């Protein structure tokens, strides 16, 4: 439905990157699936995937102390707990469900920083995603740059790797945790969730970055049958551009028509 996505692009003065995979049949929908976009906060879902490979459920109860030096531009949860700290579990919850930036950075430091995250992503077969920076500097991507970018195809592949039993890069109890957090996300109601059919469940992670970049990646489940994994990425021509979540919801509707 290439002309359908081109028409949407034009309506929102934007560029789309789309990949969706029905995991039951391998039917795919693609539109610029290999084009780089700033991944923005979608990287938080993969960072937690790596945290979960490396830590036991019990070890997620370790309390992490931090200070106001760890606070960055957007700290909705972490700003409330400077005095006591937060557990790794609580930081993952804040990162995934509120897109708390300091939470992502603390988790990233626990796993060894952006170079360690990159190594672990390469180990699962993601040759594309390029972690380089912490939040919020990772949102400052000029189009054409490869630092802190990925593609729709690569983000779907990696998200599927952590979240689903096939290929299963997490054990079951840990998969369940990641899915539960993503299902309870608070930031995505106007994105992929707004473009799926009645009765579909959604586990998503959003992001927004320079050049009006607006992304959502998700696992979606029909009332019965196999899940779809999809990424809807977008950006715009001008550095200070705004975004419109409706572009992602409408692109999701086109994907769903194509799949069903």
């Amino acid at each position, epitope marked *: 439905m290439k002309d359908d996505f081109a028409k949407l692009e034009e309506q929102f003065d934007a560029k789309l990157g789309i990949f969706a995979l029905d995991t039951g049949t391998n039917r795919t929908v693609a539109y610029r699936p290999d084009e780089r976009f700033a991944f923005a906060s979608t990287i938080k879902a993969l960072t937690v995937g790596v945290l979960l490979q490396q830590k036991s459920i019990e070890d997620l109860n370790q*309390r992490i*102390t931090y200070t106001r*030096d760890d606070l960055v531009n957007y700290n909705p949860i972490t700003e409330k707990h400077v005095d006591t700290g937060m557990t790794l579990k609580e930081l993952a919850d804040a990162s995934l469900r509120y897109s708390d930036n300091a939470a992502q950075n*603390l988790i990233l430091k626990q796993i060894g*920083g*952006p170079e*360690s995250l990159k190594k672990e992503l390469r180990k699962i077969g993601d040759e594309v995603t390029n972690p*380089e920076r912490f939040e919020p500097e990772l949102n400052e991507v000029n189009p054409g740059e490869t630092q802190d970018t990925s593609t729709a195809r690569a983000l779907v592949t990696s998200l599927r790797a952590f979240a689903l039993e096939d290929p299963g890069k997490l054990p079951s109890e840990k998969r369940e945790l990641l899915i539960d957090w993503m299902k309870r996300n608070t930031t995505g109601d106007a994105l992929i969730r707004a473009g799926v059919p009645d009765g579909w469940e959604v586990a998503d992670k959003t992001g927004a970055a320079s050049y009006g970049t607006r992304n959502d990646i998700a696992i979606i489940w029909p009332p019965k049958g196999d899940p779809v994994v999809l990424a809807v990425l977008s950006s715009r021509d001008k550095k200070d551009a705004k975004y419109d979540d409706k572009l992602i919801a409408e692109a999701t509707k086109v994907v769903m028509k194509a799949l069903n």
Partner: nanobody
Amino acid sequence: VQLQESGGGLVQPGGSLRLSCAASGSISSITTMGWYRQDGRELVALINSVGDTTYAGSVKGRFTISRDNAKNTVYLEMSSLKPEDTAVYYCNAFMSTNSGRTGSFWGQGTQVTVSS
């Protein structure tokens, strides 16, 4: 556990400095250690326990971070300093202690002033 900084001060444009940051106390392990500055707030350089480095785009090729795991100490060598590098630089280490505490710890900050 604490972080001790040293090495700041005033230098002329073009000059150089080395900052050091040493962790002390009952330390079990350290993941990332490195340097931030406030002009706003930005990472300057980070190095992990297996020697992987991250540098701010504006300093790469001029500043070198290194680490001595055995001594829990990180060093930031700064060369070809510019007036735009004038800032408070402050050290961060993500550490675990033998008492079972883990967290992001910070040094006191060190002024570097670059001026004729």
